[PDB]
């Protein structure tokens, strides 16, 4: 029963009163093609924030431009991953939200999203989030 | 990547009838020395974050502590440079989970990282000197 410790930095991107949710790309999870924010793991010896910006770079190219960012909320959790050969990991993971602001609204997605989406704040409670997507948002109030 | 140890903190912000827990620490030990704190300490591995911050109030603060709320409140990272009792010194790169918590009681008994501890009410917190990461973190909660 293997363990991971993970730090997930993760930004809600605000832009002109719309937020930037992605679409999981169909080969990922068990209900294929929900929406949720980015964000990923910090590296080690990676500050939060250096982090915040690896992440958005990665997933969302580098050509979005960001002009505020700040922390928001934390919360942890769990995860039981089993692998193929049938053995599991428990993941711990710690959520760390920022709040942001972009300047643009220029996005190019990685392979871990197949749509990106700018929605605006009355219109996310219609999309189908993912859970933990479900649970940021709703502590935000937007839902 | 930089070369720092690293290490996530979890830090109660405790209240009982509108008083702050605030914790002196001892003089030739810890990130800050002599001043007055928020207590806490790291998570270990297999913890969840609750877990850690009910056990180290545990082991600084005693059993006898009753937290009756608790919730995620606000974080952030910081760099200091923290003191053993050996003598030497490191510089760690921490990020502060900082908890809103509310006490049953007053009951303390505080180990070897404090010398002293007190129940403040908001309106007296300045008169204290109070450890620079606990006066941004009081600010913050708007009692500064």
């Given at each position: ?27 990922r999870?068990?209900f ?6 980015s ?36 919360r942890?959790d769990t ?6 050969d049938?053995?599991q ?15 643009n ?7 871990e ?31």
């Amino acid at each position: 029963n293997a363990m991971r410790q993970r730090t997930i930095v993760c930004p809600l991107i605000e832009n002109e009163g719309h937020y930037l949710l992605c679409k999981m790309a169909a080969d990922r999870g068990v209900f294929p093609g929900q929406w949720a924010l980015s964000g990923g793991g910090v590296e080690p010896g990676e500050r939060i924030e250096e982090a915040l910006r690896r992440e958005i770079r990665e997933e969302l190219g580098e050509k979005l431009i960001l002009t505020h960012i700040a922390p928001w909320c934390f919360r942890d959790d769990t995860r039981v991953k089993t692998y193929p050969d049938g053995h599991q990991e428990t993941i711990y993971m710690i959520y760390l939200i920022f709040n942001c602001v972009s300047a643009n609204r220029d996005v190019t997605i990685n392979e871990e999203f197949d749509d990106y989406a700018w929605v605006k704040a009355e219109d996310l409670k219609n999309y189908d989030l993912n859970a933990a997507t479900r649970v940021t948002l709703s502590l935000k109030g937007l839902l």
